[PDB]
Amino acid sequence: GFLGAAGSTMGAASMTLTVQARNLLSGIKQLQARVLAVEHYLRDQQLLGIWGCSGKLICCTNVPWNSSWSNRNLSEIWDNMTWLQWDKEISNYTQIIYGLLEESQNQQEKNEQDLLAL
Amino acid sequence: SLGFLGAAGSTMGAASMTLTVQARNLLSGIKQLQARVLAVEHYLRDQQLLGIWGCSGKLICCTNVPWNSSWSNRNLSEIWDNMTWLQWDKEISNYTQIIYGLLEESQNQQEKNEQDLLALD
Amino acid sequence: SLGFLGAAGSTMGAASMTLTVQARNLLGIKQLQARVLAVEHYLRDQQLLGIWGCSGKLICCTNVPWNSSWSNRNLSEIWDNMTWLQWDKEISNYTQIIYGLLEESQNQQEKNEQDLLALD
Amino acid sequence: VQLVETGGGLVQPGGSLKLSCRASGYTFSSFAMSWVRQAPGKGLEWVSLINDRGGLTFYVDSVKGRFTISRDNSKNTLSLQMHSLRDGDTAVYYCATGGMSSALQSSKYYFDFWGQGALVTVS
Amino acid sequence: ENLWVTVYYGVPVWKDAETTLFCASQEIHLENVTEEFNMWKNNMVEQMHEDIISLWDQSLKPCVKLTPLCVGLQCTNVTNNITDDMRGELKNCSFNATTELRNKRQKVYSLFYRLDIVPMVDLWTNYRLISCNTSAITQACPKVSFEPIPIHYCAPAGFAILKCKDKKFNGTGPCQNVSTVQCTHGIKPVVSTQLLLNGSLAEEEVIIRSENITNNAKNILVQLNTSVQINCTRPNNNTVKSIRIGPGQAFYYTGDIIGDIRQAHCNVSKATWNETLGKVVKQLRKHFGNNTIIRFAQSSGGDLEVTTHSFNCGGEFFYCNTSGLFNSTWSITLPCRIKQIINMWQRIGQAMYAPPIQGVIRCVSNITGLILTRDGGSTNSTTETFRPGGGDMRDNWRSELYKYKVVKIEPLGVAPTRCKRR
Ligand SMILES: *[C@@H]1O[C@H](CO)[C@@H](O[C@@H]2O[C@H](CO)[C@@H](O[C@@H]3O[C@H](CO)[C@@H](O)[C@H](O)[C@@H]3O)[C@H](O)[C@H]2NC(C)=O)[C@H](O)[C@H]1NC(C)=O
Ligand SMILES: *[C@@H]1O[C@H](CO)[C@@H](O[C@@H]2O[C@H](CO)[C@@H](O)[C@H](O)[C@H]2NC(C)=O)[C@H](O)[C@H]1NC(C)=O
Ligand SMILES: *[C@@H]1O[C@H](CO)[C@@H](O[C@@H]2O[C@H](CO)[C@@H](O)[C@H](O)[C@H]2NC(C)=O)[C@H](O)[C@H]1NC(C)=O
Ligand SMILES: *[C@@H]1O[C@H](CO)[C@@H](O[C@@H]2O[C@H](CO)[C@@H](O)[C@H](O)[C@H]2NC(C)=O)[C@H](O)[C@H]1NC(C)=O
Ligand SMILES: *[C@@H]1O[C@H](CO)[C@@H](O)[C@H](O)[C@H]1NC(C)=O
Ligand SMILES: *[C@@H]1O[C@H](CO)[C@@H](O)[C@H](O)[C@H]1NC(C)=O
Ligand SMILES: *[C@@H]1O[C@H](CO)[C@@H](O)[C@H](O)[C@H]1NC(C)=O
Ligand SMILES: *[C@@H]1O[C@H](CO)[C@@H](O)[C@H](O)[C@H]1NC(C)=O
Ligand SMILES: *[C@@H]1O[C@H](CO)[C@@H](O)[C@H](O)[C@H]1NC(C)=O
Ligand SMILES: *[C@@H]1O[C@H](CO)[C@@H](O)[C@H](O)[C@H]1NC(C)=O
Ligand SMILES: *[C@@H]1O[C@H](CO)[C@@H](O)[C@H](O)[C@H]1NC(C)=O
Ligand SMILES: *[C@@H]1O[C@H](CO)[C@@H](O)[C@H](O)[C@H]1NC(C)=O
Ligand SMILES: *[C@@H]1O[C@H](CO)[C@@H](O)[C@H](O)[C@H]1NC(C)=O
Ligand SMILES: *[C@@H]1O[C@H](CO)[C@@H](O)[C@H](O)[C@H]1NC(C)=O
Ligand SMILES: *[C@@H]1O[C@H](CO)[C@@H](O)[C@H](O)[C@H]1NC(C)=O
Ligand SMILES: *[C@@H]1O[C@H](CO)[C@@H](O)[C@H](O)[C@H]1NC(C)=O
Ligand SMILES: *[C@@H]1O[C@H](CO)[C@@H](O)[C@H](O)[C@H]1NC(C)=O
Ligand SMILES: *[C@@H]1O[C@H](CO)[C@@H](O)[C@H](O)[C@H]1NC(C)=O
Ligand SMILES: *[C@@H]1O[C@H](CO)[C@@H](O)[C@H](O)[C@H]1NC(C)=O
Ligand SMILES: *[C@@H]1O[C@H](CO)[C@@H](O)[C@H](O)[C@H]1NC(C)=O
Ligand SMILES: *[C@@H]1O[C@H](CO)[C@@H](O)[C@H](O)[C@H]1NC(C)=O
Ligand SMILES: *[C@@H]1O[C@H](CO)[C@@H](O)[C@H](O)[C@H]1NC(C)=O
Ligand SMILES: *[C@@H]1O[C@H](CO)[C@@H](O)[C@H](O)[C@H]1NC(C)=O
Ligand SMILES: *[C@@H]1O[C@H](CO)[C@@H](O)[C@H](O)[C@H]1NC(C)=O
Ligand SMILES: *[C@@H]1O[C@H](CO)[C@@H](O)[C@H](O)[C@H]1NC(C)=O
Ligand SMILES: *[C@@H]1O[C@H](CO)[C@@H](O)[C@H](O)[C@H]1NC(C)=O
Ligand SMILES: *[C@@H]1O[C@H](CO)[C@@H](O)[C@H](O)[C@H]1NC(C)=O
Ligand SMILES: *[C@@H]1O[C@H](CO)[C@@H](O)[C@H](O)[C@H]1NC(C)=O
């Protein structure tokens, strides 16, 4: 169910991404609410697009993980944490991570542009 | 060449070549804004539903869900050469939600398999 | 680091490095009309890229060859010696032909890929 | 279906030769087309295949860098342009219909409606 | 057969759906497409009705209210060369009106129609205006008009309008000649109660449309292929005067009449209306038995808005009497009355005052259809009677929207192919 995996561990909650999806899109106040929901959805989709993750729910990237963001191992991160606690732990670095993700895509397309130019 | 819905009465094979003509026509005082928001919401729900299936950015999307003979047992010649999209859509009523669920599950498995394949050093 | 449209007066080969800066800045009745028209312009551009098979990309290479009748210039003068505004003015009223060719090329590519993926 | 080769029949080693097929008894644009080669006394082998729309071409490795196969749905014409012909390419070249179909058609993966065959000799 | 699901976007499939349409002020033919239409389930009619009500109500808000009127007034017989037909129909009435100053009064006289006045027993007065005990009266702004300017209904993006072009389409059932449009043709919101004016003509014969041709409670819409020209007129050179009744609120009234006073008559040519009724009967005989002798009769009594034919003319709101028509056993002049305090949409609480229009009014309208209500009693005989009648004012727009349907586009679909991913 919607947000049912919020209290589950991240390893289990990552398999319900399509359940959390679809609930993002569906007298002046109702129209403002609809426009706001559409605007937030499109901002998130554009943010994925500029990272090279468009059309995917689980997108792997080329940005290495910095141990200063979190020094936990994968077993502790994925089996002993929920997404809410993880989101709280690394919120102070989230925008930095986003910037790095954007930069990686800026390089990646240029490399592809060169590889297809041979 | 045939117009917005000119291929509606043509066969499914012929009509499959006019997808962009119809795709362009899905996007283009309080009630006018309500109509525009409804059009945007329908477009975005369809694009999201394609994205869930891994079909984002394509108008013709091949998938990994096998066709069940209980949905329709017609061969490809009858479906594509002797039938229109309206008659076909009528034929597969009550089955589209099963197909959509199977496509969603198949793409979730595809994403997990791709993530695991990309995790090999 | 230059900011929104900061590269507008730079050359095309330099301004092409700041596409994400422009992309991130594209998103009571009058206020709703302005927000809905901004959303509609964004969605029409994204649908148009999708029709061309360029969804999810900012720099998208295609299979349409360049016609010498559209702009009889070499890459050095186009990319290193002129701006995107001058280019946009130079190829005005040629963009609809290019868009039609891109649409047809993507339709042919989708049919070819479907046929290639139909081989056992 | 009266599929008839109108190509040449004598070339020097290292030269080029064009073959073509004309069809009349079937819808040309509805079928894939191919060329199949029969060297004397060695049986038959497939050489090249083209899709029904003409956008896709496939070759055996021994000719991939030398032969170009093309088709024109107008005038119902198949063409094969062979460059750098070798002594091993002396054979009867037959037109064939099928061997491929689009995703919206039933499977074939077989050859039908064979032509009568052009004889190509490399001196 | 080793078939796999392939998803297509841009699929030419649509489903019946209704939504909000744009009011504006091309056609693509669909070969081998048969669509089912139903003009009595088409929500474009209800939306057009509600939109016209909204525009009507909004147009009367920024206008002069007549609450300084609705006083007792003393009426007498008009002194002029008045014919017999106009005796008692027009009265010369006087009243005390307010001025631009709160503490001033003026004595004003004007000519009112009898239908705008109700008798009242009081002292120094003997009449009052109608719709003063109930509702309120708002004067229509003189700077606007009621001309039926054609409008277009346009579907929103994601929707399409299907148009049926079958020459003999009867408003329901399958249609084989179908085209797709984004906007309808220009539709004139002409307001009439018994005859359909300035509408569309049929390509062939006469088209008889009814939700249930055997149920007497449903109306029959008759659309002709040829128009019948109706010429109407108010042959009286009325001189219109105006007064200020408040700080910037001006009231318009009939001041006087120059020349003799005669009725407002409307002429229907005999040589066209005859044989037009013959064609209507010939097509009615396609649904009723050949042994039945179809007769026409004047409508039954009741409210004036339904017993009379009340087409708007220019700015006056003529209420012609159609007893000269639809009287047979299958030049005609008909006495056309007028009125000024109008309950336009069969509503109480929104009475509108139509100001008199200067000079003579001579309208030339095209009759393109009409509304029949049958005998009502459905007599089990061979003398079936058709009376004209009205409705809820939506049939006037069904006569134009009958050929349009709104559909929602379903661009997403699935189909088996031999295309496996990977
Ligand atoms: C059906 O259509 C006819 C023809 O369009 C309508 O008659 C037209 O009505 C308009 C408005 O009533 C007339 O305009 C008027 O013209 C005079 C010219 O002096 C002007 O002073 C007025 O202010 C107004 O603009 C127009 O002349 C008239 N056309 C003809 C040929 O007579 C008719 O009213 C329509 N039917 C109904 C029921 O409305
Ligand atoms: C309506 O009545 C008014 C007053 O009852 C008439 O106005 C008077 O008309 C006479 C002519 O018959 C003049 O001599 C007076 O001077 C008028 N008085 C005022 C105050 O105007 C008016 O003429 C009548 N109108 C009609 C059409 O009968
Ligand atoms: C309009 O108002 C005038 C006065 O403002 C009315 O005439 C007077 O009526 C009173 C009734 O009590 C008489 O006593 C006066 O003699 C009248 N005035 C004159 C000068 O004779 C008149 O009746 C009002 N008319 C209407 C229709 O309301
Ligand atoms: C408001 O006044 C009107 C008349 O102006 C009243 O109309 C009456 O209607 C009934 C029919 O229902 C008739 O029998 C009466 O004769 C009418 N009255 C007159 C004076 O002719 C109407 O009833 C009044 N409104 C209300 C709510 O009572
Ligand atoms: C909550 O924690 C318990 C601990 O055993 C676990 O069994 C349960 O599955 C958890 N809830 C969810 C929704 O995963
Ligand atoms: C990790 O982060 C620190 C500061 O948070 C930074 O100095 C360091 O360079 C980062 N790691 C890499 C590999 O760049
Ligand atoms: C992860 O770190 C924690 C530190 O609390 C440790 O207890 C745990 O064993 C570690 N896991 C692995 C797989 O090394
Ligand atoms: C984030 O920063 C705020 C103040 O900048 C600090 O109070 C908070 O604890 C920080 N979060 C983490 C997870 O360290
Ligand atoms: C309608 O059907 C006929 C059948 O002969 C076909 O030839 C025609 O192409 C069809 N219409 C369209 C628009 O394809
Ligand atoms: C088709 O649907 C039926 C419904 O029970 C199911 O049993 C069958 O396995 C399905 N076919 C395939 C190939 O999965
Ligand atoms: C498809 O099925 C129909 C009906 O059974 C049959 O007539 C037709 O020949 C079949 N076609 C193929 C290619 O199997
Ligand atoms: C879908 O279900 C309805 C329910 O009665 C049925 O009438 C209809 O025929 C079904 N669809 C098909 C294609 O059989
Ligand atoms: C403006 O032109 C000069 C000329 O060389 C160039 O050096 C400078 O970088 C240009 N400005 C920008 C923003 O690129
Ligand atoms: C585009 O190129 C073709 C040849 O490649 C030429 O015939 C055509 O005229 C060119 N386009 C224009 C607009 O001139
Ligand atoms: C491009 O064309 C211009 C036009 O004269 C010329 O000056 C310039 O040298 C050319 N550059 C190249 C790299 O060919
Ligand atoms: C097309 O664009 C060029 C670019 O300068 C312009 O000169 C030309 O006038 C345009 N064509 C028309 C018909 O305006
Ligand atoms: C005024 O008109 C009415 C209408 O019927 C009539 O009964 C009355 O006798 C007339 N009075 C005069 C004085 O002409
Ligand atoms: C309208 O025409 C259709 C055409 O099939 C017919 O079935 C239907 O009974 C007709 N209805 C009326 C009221 O004439
Ligand atoms: C459909 O209507 C159009 C209107 O122009 C006409 O040309 C066409 O012949 C009609 N077709 C049929 C089959 O009635
Ligand atoms: C109108 O229909 C009648 C029916 O018989 C016919 O006689 C007449 O010629 C038609 N007129 C036109 C203009 O189509
Ligand atoms: C009309 O209504 C009557 C009411 O009983 C019904 O019997 C009849 O079948 C209806 N006819 C149509 C055509 O709907
Ligand atoms: C109506 O007909 C009568 C008959 O004589 C004529 O006097 C009158 O002027 C006509 N009016 C119009 C408006 O045609
Ligand atoms: C109506 O008046 C016009 C003048 O515009 C005249 O030609 C026509 O014959 C008249 N028709 C009738 C029925 O009086
Ligand atoms: C009634 O008369 C018309 C006149 O032509 C005829 O076509 C129709 O068939 C007749 N009906 C019957 C039931 O005989
Ligand atoms: C129309 O005129 C006739 C002529 O006698 C009359 O009987 C009928 O009542 C009139 N209609 C109205 C609504 O007054
Ligand atoms: C109807 O027509 C008859 C035929 O003579 C006539 O006597 C009668 O007066 C007419 N009805 C009206 C209301 O004029
Ligand atoms: C009515 O009379 C006035 C008197 O001034 C005149 O100006 C006007 O033209 C006349 N109108 C008609 C329609 O006779
Ligand atoms: C009325 O009918 C006549 C008949 O030819 C036509 O010329 C005229 O345009 C029509 N007027 C309207 C407003 O429909």
D118: domain CATH number? 2.60.40.10
Nearest CA in chain D to B79: D104
Contacts of E30 (CB under 8 A, 6+ apart): B5, B6, B8, B9, E162, E178, E179, E180
The CA distance from E229 to E267, in Å, is 9
Structure-token pair, residue E417: 């192919």
* Cα distance between residue E56 and residue D14, in whole Å: 88
Q: In terms of Cα–Cα distance, which of D106, B60, C112, B97 is closest to E2?
A: D106
d(CA E411, CA E160): 12
Tokens encoding B30 = 């309080």
- Please indicate if any CB of chain E lies within 8 Å of the CB of C59: no
- Strands E90-98 and E74-77, by their bridges, are antiparallel
C-alpha to C-alpha distance for E337 and E310, rounded to whole angstroms: 9
Task: Please tell me the distance from the alpha carbon of residue E232 to that of residue E320, in angstroms, as a whole number.
Answer: 9
Chain centroid, CA C6 distance in Å = 19
Measured between alpha carbons, how far is residue A54 from residues A17, B57, C57, E100 in Å? 15, 9, 8, 70
A99/E333 Cα distance (integer angstroms): 85
Q: In sequence order, what are the beta bridge partners of E391?
A: none
CA distance E16 to chain C (A): 25
Among residues E294, E218, E301, E253, the alpha carbon closest in space to that of E39 is found at E218
Residue E66: phi and psi, rounded to 5, are -105, 25
Helix (H, G, I), strand (E, B) or coil at E275: helix
Please state whether beta strands E404-409 and E159-164 pair in parallel, antiparallel, or not at all (unpaired). antiparallel
What dihedral do alpha carbons A43, A46, A52, A55 form, nearest 10°?
Answer: 90
Q: Which of C43, E54, D20, A13 is nearest to B23 (CA)?
A: C43
Helix, strand, coil share (%) of chain E residues, nearest 5: 10, 40, 50
Nearest by Cα to E225 from E202, E241, E196:
E202
Beta bridge partners of E90: E113
**A91: which DSSP letter?**
G
A87's tokens: 């989101």
Cβ proximity of E307 and E301 under 8 Å: yes
Strand partners, E197: E367
Contact D104 B75 (CB under 8 A): no
d(CA D91, CA D62): 14
Domain total for chain D?
A: 1
E417, D103: Cβ pair inside 8 Å?
yes
Which chain C residues are within 8 Å of A31, Cβ to Cβ? 32
Q: What is the Cα–Cα distance from B87 to B90, expressed in whole angstroms?
A: 5
Name which residue sits closest to atom 10 of ligand 11, judged by CA: B75
D30 close contact with C: CB closer than 8 A = no
Q: C109 C-alpha to center of ligand 14: Å?
A: 21
Question: Read out DSSP for D25-92?
Answer: SS-GGGS-EEEEEE-TTS-EEEEEEE-SSS--EEE-TTTTTTEEEEEETGGGEEEEEE-S--GGG-EE
Distances (CA, A) of E291 to A101, E287, E387: 86, 12, 20
Tokens standing for A102? 């954007």
Q: Do the Cβ atoms of B118 and A60 come closer than 8 Å?
A: yes
E strand intervals along E100-219 = 105-113, 117-119, 127-129, 137-139, 152-154, 159-164, 172-175, 178-181, 195-197, 206-210
Q: Is E157 in the pocket of ligand 23 (CB under 6 A)?
A: no
Residue E143 to residue E139: CA distance in whole angstroms? 11
Q: Is C108 on the interface with D (CB under 8 A)?
A: yes
At CA D51, angle to CA D46 and CA D54, rounded to 5?
A: 120
Q: In whole angstroms, what is the distance from residue E89 CA to residue E84 CA?
A: 10
Contact criterion met (CB below 8 Å) for E307 and E316: no
Neighbouring-strand partners of residue D118: D93
Paired tokens of D85:
């012909």
What's the full length of chain A, in residues?
Answer: 118
Contact B30 A34 (CB under 8 A): no
Is E147 touching ligand 1 by the criterion CB < 6 Å? yes
Neighbouring chains of E at 3+ CB pairs under 8 Å are: B, C, D
Type of residue at E90: L
Closest CA to E161 of E72, E42, E279, E74: E42
List the domain range (segments joined by +) for residue D109. Answer: 2-122
Quote the tokens at residue E188.
């004139």
Nearest Cα of chain B lies from the Cα of A10 at a distance, in angstroms, of 14
Rounded CA separation E108/E243 (Å)? 9
Which residues are registered as beta bridge partners of D45? D37
Matching residue, tokens 């929500």: E43
Contact C23 A43 (CB under 8 A): no
E327 Cα: distance to centroid of ligand 26 (angstroms): 7
Query: E347: Cβ–Cβ under 8 A, 6 or more apart, which residues?
Result: none
DSSP state of E98: E
Helix H segments across E242-382? Answer: 270-284, 304-307
Nearest in space to E371 (alpha carbons), one of E348, E388, E351: E388
Q: Which residues of chain A are within 8 Å of residue C26 when distances are taken between CB atoms?
A: 46
- C-beta atoms surrounding E322 within 10 Å: 21
E333 CB near ligand 23 (under 6 Å): no
Structure determination method = cryo-EM
Q: Which of C12, C20, C31, C42 is the best mutation test for A, with the most CBs of A within 10 A?
A: C20
The CA distance from B49 to B100, in Å, is: 9
Question: CA torsion E237→E238→E241→E245, rounded to 10°?
Answer: -160
Q: What CA–CA distance (Å, rounded) separates A4 from A19? A: 9
**Which residue's structure tokens are 């399958």?**
E174
How far, in Å, from the CA of E107 to the mean position of ligand 3? Answer: 9
Resolution in A: 3.3
Element (H, E) at A10: helix A10-13
* Alpha helical stretches, state H, B4-82: 12-15, 19-23, 30-52, 76-81
Q: Which of chain E's residues have a Cβ under 8 Å away from the Cβ of C120? A: 2, 418
Smallest Cα distance from C113 to chain D, Å? 9
8 A C-beta contact, residue E316 and residue E254: no
Separation CA D65–CA E326 (nearest Å): 89
Name the amino acid, one letter, at C98: I
Owner of token pair 């360029």:
C54
Q: How far apart are CA B43 and CA B25, in angstroms?
A: 11
| CA nearest neighbour of B32 among C93, C33, E82, A68 | C33
Q: Contact D102/C111, CB-based, under 8 Å?
A: yes
Q: Which two tokens stand for residue E156?
A: 């929103």
Beta carbons within 10 angstroms of residue E380's beta carbon? 5
Token reading at B86: 């309206």
Which 3 state secondary structure label does DSSP give B93?
Answer: coil
Q: Which residues does a 6 A CB cutoff place in the pocket of ligand 3?
A: E 72-74, 94-96, 105, 107, 124-125
Return the DSSP state at E255. E
**Residues, chain B, total?**
121
Residues 6+ apart with CB under 8 A from E212: E218
